[PDB]
Amino acid sequence: TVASISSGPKHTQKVPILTANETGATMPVLPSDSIETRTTYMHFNGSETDVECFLGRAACVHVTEIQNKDATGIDNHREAKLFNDWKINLSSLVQLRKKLELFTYVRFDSEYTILATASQPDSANYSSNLVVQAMYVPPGAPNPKEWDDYTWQSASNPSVFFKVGDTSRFSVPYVGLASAYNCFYDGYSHDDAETQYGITVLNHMGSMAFRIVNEHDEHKTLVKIRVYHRAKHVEAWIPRAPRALPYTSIGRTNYPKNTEPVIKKRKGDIKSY
Amino acid sequence: GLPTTTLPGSGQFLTTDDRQSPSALPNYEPTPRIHIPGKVHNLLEIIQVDTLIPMNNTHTKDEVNSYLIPLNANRQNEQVFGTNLFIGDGVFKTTLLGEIVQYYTHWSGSLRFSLMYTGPALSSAKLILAYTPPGARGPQDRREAMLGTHVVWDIGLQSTIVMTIPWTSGVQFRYTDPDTYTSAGFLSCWYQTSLILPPETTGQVYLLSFISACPDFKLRLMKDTQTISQTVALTE
Amino acid sequence: GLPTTTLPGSGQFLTTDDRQSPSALPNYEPTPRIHIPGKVHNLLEIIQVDTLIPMNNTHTKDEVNSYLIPLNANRQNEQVFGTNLFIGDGVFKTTLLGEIVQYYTHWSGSLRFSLMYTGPALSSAKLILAYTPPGARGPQDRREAMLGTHVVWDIGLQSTIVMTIPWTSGVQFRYTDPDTYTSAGFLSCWYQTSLILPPETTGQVYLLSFISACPDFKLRLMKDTQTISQTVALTE
Amino acid sequence: GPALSSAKLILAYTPPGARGPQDRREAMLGTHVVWDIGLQSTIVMTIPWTSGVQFRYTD
Amino acid sequence: INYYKDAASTSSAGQSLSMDPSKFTEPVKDLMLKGAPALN
Amino acid sequence: INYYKDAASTSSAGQSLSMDPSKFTEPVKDLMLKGAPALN
Amino acid sequence: GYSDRVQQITLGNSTITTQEAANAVVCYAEWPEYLPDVDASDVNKTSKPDTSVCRFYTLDSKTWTTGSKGWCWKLPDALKDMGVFGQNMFFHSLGRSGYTVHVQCNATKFHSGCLLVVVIPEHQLASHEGGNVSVKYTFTHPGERGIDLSSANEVGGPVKDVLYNMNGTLLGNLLIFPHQFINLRTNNTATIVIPYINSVPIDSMTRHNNVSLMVIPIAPLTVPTGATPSLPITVTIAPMCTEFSGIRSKSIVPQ
Ligand SMILES: COc1ccc(OCCCCCCn2ccnc2)c(Cl)c1
């Protein structure tokens, strides 16, 4: 492939460099339309800018935490982190959001990877070996109420058992009601005068419930869960302007008030170098 | 039972791998795809669309006005604007090109810089745009500027002029984050003759300026952008 | 010894896998299969059999009577019953259809709603059944109702009428657990003319109503049902 | 008008049955042409035959 | 070799090697030729 | 590839792709045609 | 003698002529078309009023003055009240449509000024409150009036800051969306053909707008000496290939 062809002096009536940008086109002008060039080859394919590659590496999408401790006398397991949810996202941790929101519509298979590490902040004789259980108690699915409810039987509901310190991997097809996931949605769930706005209406896919299967030892053990997400089989439609201001909320476009100028001011003139 | 040996790296999680993993919910069944206009396949497809450069960066809070390069009637010999070409920083940085370049470590290729004139139709002007390849200082006067890559632009019916910064380089890749060894030059613009307004007309006229990449362009070695960060996880 | 590397996920137990495992008791020998009528292969086979809907839900303890929709002689213009179409909740919820839908997260397809009349043979009646697609309120009078999907039913020798709620939807799947965006409409029924009883006869007559799914139907993404739970393991 | 002036007009035909339009919104819902005044000096609007009965009276 | 039955479980896809910027760079109704005047 | 000798040790079965609701939806002795009267 | 410059669009019973065009944009290089069966889901036969809905509606005019910040209309909202298009809209459960948008602004060879005319698929607005405040319905359904970016923040309304496109992105990059400029010195109209763009084959016309049309002054209007300091901008829009499905009772929407 040639990156530049050889081209010499020109004295024509045919001027490729004068255009009318009002038309909305970006005319494909090249170095050889306005200087004299020599042949050179590309030596490159643009492999690593493919959208499959761009969205295809694991990104941290969520960090939560649960603890193993005596539940005796706990009136609210959920509240004691005796177990804990995660309202499936992908727009909470902004690093992968900007990436994703570079596109309007987007379709991609999935591959989740869960790392769990334990901490024992206060005096323990040892480090126990805990098994985590991760489950999908979606829309219709009985939500766990205690850390050892009938829910955890999860006999129809997928659920993972791995050891703290290890990692739990698995993948998932596109479980989005429509043909693509909306990165943006300028609508409502119905014509209500007060209903919510954004995509918070669509992004319906229940939550993930984590818990330790082990009963309690004498000390307490903090287990912190990190969920990583990798898109596989990606398809993206309609590019948009990149995100400039900071994010404030999952699912709304809102930016913070009295934000700071995002364009760097010159130290000098327009004329400055 | 077949005998195996495990190598160094067993059990590691590399976020940049591409191996198989079981399907949590088998026999599922995705929803069919329907047709949607606009599919993107490569980021190289989109960085060829031009977008406006806030060249007039001199303000103090972001304003529509930093997209406008002003022009003065009757000045002769003088300089319209100047900038270095660190596409990952400075004026370029918020443009779509600048914004994508920042997802990669290295770039190579030609850039297309165009200026669209917005003055009254009955006015006229001749400007010179000059590209100064690495190695010399930003030009200080047109004489200096005109000895490097340049285009005399004659403002006419055809409203825009497309200047190309041809890839001039020893090393075949430059860093997107500004680096010296790897630096690309300067871009300046001067009156060639001068802007002239018709009667009954007055004041400043402005040029809009765009930037996009030539088909020439290469970007490689993906990394994280300095353009976005956060202090606590967001919630709904 | 062949060199290997283990990946992330090694040692995990995913209750949704399909791999091989050794046979605890080899060379065993199962008992032969004999023929048994009734084999089921797909849950889609059974949700097409219709079952009764406790439409008359207004009681206070479960009774045979909530399966009976009453009809009054001589009323004109008025409304016989109304319900939304959240097949995973409310009247639908205990029906076989409702009961299976609850094992899945998403459903799509047409529903078949039929009414069998049980009044004396020498009586007569004309009813209108109306399906109101998502977007409007439950109809408030027949005029409103008759502008959407409807069937004038003439009570005759042929005892049942089968109304179909054709799949009317933007999005190709709806949630089985009631959700707004994903909501399916309303179903109402009104006197078209009115029920008329023969002489020597009196009181209320009832309609029985059934629900089953058309061959159209799709259910996907299995999950756990809210319809059953427990607090301690059972024993013998 | 002078050559250096410019204008955009809308001509509207309202078929029998409605009143003479009272504002452009009303007018623009019937047969209309946006005319852009340019080099080409004249605009030709056609009142297409809109009618139940195939002849009308001249009086 | 796929070891698994479902398609979601396969590795990353392979390069589009599609690439056609014209839907984005030249969505004009009447075709523009480089070198010919923009506005005739 | 089965690694094991016994049939119980193989993975899940593969979709019936049988599907015939008529034993449940139309177990009538004399065949009913849709469109023809139910009771003649 | 054909110029890129003169054009005629006839759609239904209405025609537009421009003698100073700058080509026309067809979003994503695709022209509006009806919904194919292979893509269909709802089993209902659809209604295609054709020429009674696919004609040109001219919205009320705006006034560009030196202080203008820009205006924003949403589709199909802007047309919610135009003739039979609008009736069909409130009466069917689902509908689908593409449009031809023609923005008009003429001046003289002594004026200067340049407007950006852009179509943004799925333009989800931001609340000026920040945090996760929502933007109420009424605020994103201005009707033919559209939203005036130089109007004041209101409560439950969107933010109207132009350098941020009403969503946290920079004005400068709107050029990645199908768009066309109106530069008084060149141009006097902008025309964009919009194909139907959605993640579902057909949708509700009232709970979801699928494009915002935005007209933004970028190079300020500058009139000749002692000229009146303003110009009107007019927007005319025509539904094209419209289809409605799931007819019934007639939606009632807030406010
Ligand atoms: C632990 O076992 C599981 C079994 C099934 C599961 O499926 C998860 C599907 C969620 C996909 C989310 C993709 N997304 C969400 C919003 N935007 C993109 C999950 Cl997450 C876990």
Curated annotation (Swiss-Prot), chains B, C:
Subcellular location: Virion; Host cytoplasm
Subunit structure: Interacts with capsid protein VP0 and capsid protein VP1 to form heterotrimeric protomers. Five protomers subsequently associate to form pentamers which serve as building blocks for the capsid. Interacts with capsid protein VP4 in the mature capsid. Interacts with protein 2C; this interaction may be important for virion morphogenesis.
Protein task: Forms an icosahedral capsid of pseudo T=3 symmetry with capsid proteins VP2 and VP3. The capsid is 300 Angstroms in diameter, composed of 60 copies of each capsid protein and enclosing the viral positive strand RNA genome.
Protein name per the record: Capsid protein VP3
Full-protein residues shown: 332 to 567 of 2179
Swiss-Prot record, chain G:
Domain of life, source organism: Viruses
Location of the protein in the cell: Virion; Host cytoplasm
Subunit text: Interacts with capsid protein VP1 and capsid protein VP3 in the mature capsid.
Function: Forms an icosahedral capsid of pseudo T=3 symmetry with capsid proteins VP2 and VP3. The capsid is 300 Angstroms in diameter, composed of 60 copies of each capsid protein and enclosing the viral positive strand RNA genome.
Name by which UniProt lists this protein: Capsid protein VP2
Annotated source species: Human rhinovirus 14
Whole-protein residues included: 77 to 331 of 2179
